[PDB]
């Protein structure tokens, strides 16, 4: 049942050392590629980063940006990150066997909406295949974009470390859906 | 496999009048609600429109805005709309038994990304239940927002007509997924 896949999927920020077969990632990209999109533009592009030096570069730029973010963060965001024990450290950016970078085509109508919709598909497909992921959004996308020679027509949306999950922390709660009818 | 569900799912712009059980629609919201989100804020909000008067108001406000849009659109979207023989009339906004209005909580971090990801889950769940949908995005959400007394805290992201498909048109093609390694 799809609800079972969705309910069981949780963030994974800690991965096994072993590298999953690329076929599993490709499968999940093929699932995502079946998603709808504005104008059927299919505005998602994928970059699979496996090179260890490059992952380390990405980790370093993101951690340097997170350090500044964590120094400055305030209020609700700070409290949430503190209560979940987040810090600027992002070891998974180096340790995950794959970094799946997801880009949107700037010129496509509803490109960013469509790519995030497709990311929904992608995440469920990774769960189906027994892989873990976290949608990681660093403070400064441009620095990561430059590291991988991103063309001007593309926009990095999210970094998805992918790998075999390793002793994940539990899924956070979900409040029940409360619907409204006709009008607020 | 999830791939088969994703491959099968296509736009539905032709609906039966027959009303699906509410639980079939609620199921899809329950699946979507299991999705990840920025800071686990669960920033989606659902408004189920069924009242025929209100559906008509929404339809006419959207059609007016579309008619102006179709008079003025140019470039690639105009070319695609023309070759698909799209027009500004939106009968599915009356014919669908449900208009599911999906909102994002503006104050939540990565609210829009998170809601569109959940919409990806939602569309797959609707397909699992044999329901059809189209992510309808009219040119002027503000007028629709006002019609349903949207609070200032929420942004209407998409109108999802939901119903039983009435022999919908075939799925459009998909280019092969575009996957690169390490750098562009
Ligand atoms: C973000 C987004 C916005 C969309 N907006 C509209 C819309 O305003 N009107 C419409 O008829 N279809 C809309 N669609 C549906 C697309 O036209 C459709 O997903 C695309 O043609 C692929 O259809 P297929 O899956 O049947 O091949 C939208 C889809 C997405 C993802
Ligand atoms: C748009 C978006 C951005 C996210 N950004 C980050 C991030 O920058 N760092 C991180 O650790 N997790 C990030 N997450 C993961 C969320 O914190 C996670 O989905 C949420 O805590 C719920 O986790 P659960 O499904 O395991 O309960 C992001 C999630 C989404 C949807
Ligand atoms: N909203 C208009 C035009 C339109 C149509 C399809 C589509 O994928 C996109 I993005 C826009 C209409 O519904 O006709
Ligand atoms: N990017 C920072 C903060 C962060 C964390 C979780 C999250 O859901 C969101 I949105 C932001 C970090 O990765 O620590
Ligand atoms: Cl997550
Ligand atoms: Cl097409
Ligand atoms: Cl669609
Ligand atoms: Cl939480
Ligand atoms: Cl917003
Ligand atoms: Cl149709």
Q: What CATH number is associated with residue B69?
A: 3.40.109.10
CA distance B118 to B148: 22
Domain residue limits at B157: 2-163
Burial of A116 (0-12, 13-18, 19+ CB in 10 A): buried
- The single-letter DSSP state of residue B155 is E
Residue B56 contacts A, CB cutoff 8 Å: no
Strand-by-strand arrangement of the B44-49 sheet = A180-181, B44-49, B98-105, B154-163, B132-133
Q: What are phi and psi of A25, to 5 degrees?
A: -70, -45
For residues B29 and B33, give the distance between their C-alpha atoms in angstroms, rounded to a whole number: 6
Beta bridge partners of B44: B104
> Angle at CA A86, nearest 5°, toward A93 and A166?
55
Distances (CA, A) of A132 to A63, A66, A165, B93, B115: 21, 22, 5, 39, 21
Nearest CB to A35; choose among B6, B30, B110: B6
Quote the tokens at residue A120.
């929904």
Query: What distances in angstroms separate CA B30 from CA A179, B7, B67, B148, one per listed residue?
Result: 11, 22, 35, 23
Give the integer Cα–Cα distance in Å for B84 and B173: 13
Task: Tell me whether residue B85 is annotated as binding.
Answer: no
Q: Judge whether B182 lies within some domain.
A: no
Residue of A nearest to B31 (CA): A3
Specify the 3-state DSSP secondary structure of B38.
helix
Task: Of A129, A163, A114, give the one whose Cα is nearest residue A15.
Answer: A163
Closest by Cα among A159, A172, A183 to A55: A159
Asked if A88 and A70 count as a contact pair (C-beta separation under 8 A), the reply is yes
Q: Which two structure tokens, joined as six digits, stand for A182?
A: 């006709």
Q: Residue B49 is nearest to which of A2, A125, A182, comparing CB atoms?
A: A182
Give strand ranges (E) for A89-152.
Answer: 98-105, 132-133
Distances (CA, A) of B14 to A165, B59, B67, B95, B167: 42, 15, 20, 8, 7
Q: Is A1 annotated as a binding residue?
A: no
Contact B62, B156 (CB under 8 A): no
Total domains, chain B: 1
Helix B22-33 with B111-128: angle, nearest 10 deg: 140
Q: If DSSP codes are grouped into helix, strand and coil, which group holds residue B47?
A: strand
Burial class (CB in 10 A: 0-12, 13-18, 19+), A28: buried
- Please give the distance, rounded to the nearest whole angstrom, from the Cα atom of residue B114 to the centre of ligand 8: 14
Tokens of B32: 């979507």
Tokens of A121: 């598909």
Distance in angstroms (rounded) separating the CA atoms of residues B85 and B83: 5
Taking the C-alpha atoms of residue A25 and residue A155, their distance in angstroms, rounded to an integer, is 21
Residues from chain A that touch B160, judged by Cβ atoms under 8 A, are none
Q: Which two tokens stand for residue A37?
A: 């999109």
Is B36 within any annotated ligand binding site?
yes
**Residue A45 dihedral angles phi and psi, to the nearest 5°:** -135, 145
How is residue A40 annotated by DSSP?
G
**Residue B102 belongs to a domain:** yes
Residue A14 lies in a domain: yes
For B87, other C-beta atoms within 10 Å of its C-beta total 12
Residues of chain B with Cβ-Cβ distance to A2 below 8 Å are: 2, 5, 31, 121, 124-125, 128
Inter-residue contact A99 to A49 (CB < 8 Å): yes
Q: Does B83 touch chain A (CB under 8 A)?
A: no
Distances A121 to A181, B9, B46 between C-alpha atoms, Å:
27, 12, 20
Query: How many residues make up chain B in this entry?
Result: 184
Ligand 3 neighbourhood includes A38 CB (under 6 angstroms): yes
CA-based nearest distance B149→chain A, Å: 5
- Helices B111-128, A111-128: axis angle to 10 degrees equals 60
> In A70-90, which positions are buried (b, 16+ CB within 10 angstroms) versus exposed (e)?
beebeeeeeeebeeeebebeb
- Way the structure was solved: X-ray
- The A residues from 114 to 153 touching B (CB cutoff 8 Å) are 114, 116-121, 123-125, 128, 135, 137, 147-151
CB contact (8 A) between residue A39 and residue B80: yes
Report which ligand 2 atom has the smallest distance to the Cα of A10. 26
Cα–Cα distance list, A159 to A100, A138, B68, B96 (Å): 6, 8, 39, 37
CB under 5 Å of ion ligand 10: residues: B 13-14, 168-169
CA A32 to chain centre: 13
Could you give the CA distance from residue A150 to residue A166 in angstroms, rounded to a whole number?
Answer: 31
Q: Let me know: does A97 contact A50? Beta carbons within 8 Å.
A: yes
Does some domain include residue B175? no
What is the Rg, in whole angstroms, of the alpha carbon atoms belonging to chain A?
A: 17
Bridge partners for A181 per DSSP = B48
The answer for residues whose C-beta is within 8 angstroms of residue B158's C-beta and 6 or more apart is: A113, B101, B102, B119, B135, B136, B137
- Please give the DSSP secondary-structure letter assigned to residue B42: -
For A158, the closest chain B residue by CA position comes to: B113
Interchain pair A116, B121: CB under 8 A? no
Tokens for B94, please give them.
């009356």
DSSP summary character for residue B40:
G
Strands B132-133 and A98-105: unpaired
Q: Is residue B183 part of a domain?
A: no
């Amino acid at each position: 049942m799809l609800y079972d896949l969705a309910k069981k999927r949780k963030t994974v920020r800690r991965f096994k050392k072993e590298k999953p077969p690329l076929e599993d990632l490709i499968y999940s990209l093929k699932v995502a590629n079946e998603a709808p999109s504005g104008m059927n533009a299919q505005p998602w592009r994928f970059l699979i980063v496996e090179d260890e030096k490059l992952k380390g570069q990405i980790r370093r730029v993101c951690e340097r940006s997170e350090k500044t973010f964590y120094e400055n963060v305030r209020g609700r965001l700070k409290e949430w990150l503190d209560e979940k024990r987040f810090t600027w450290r992002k070891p998974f950016l180096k340790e995950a066997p794959y970094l799946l970078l997801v880009f949107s085509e700037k010129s496509a109508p509803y490109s960013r909406e469509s790519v995030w919709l497709a990311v929904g598909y992608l995440l469920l497909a990774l769960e189906e295949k027994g892989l873990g992921s976290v949608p990681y959004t660093p403070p400064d996308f441009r620095e990561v974009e430059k590291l991988v020679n991103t063309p001007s027509e593309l926009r990095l949306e999210v970094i998805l470390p992918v790998g075999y999950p390793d002793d994940p922390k539990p899924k956070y709660p979900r409040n029940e859906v409360i619907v409204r009818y006709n009008t607020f």
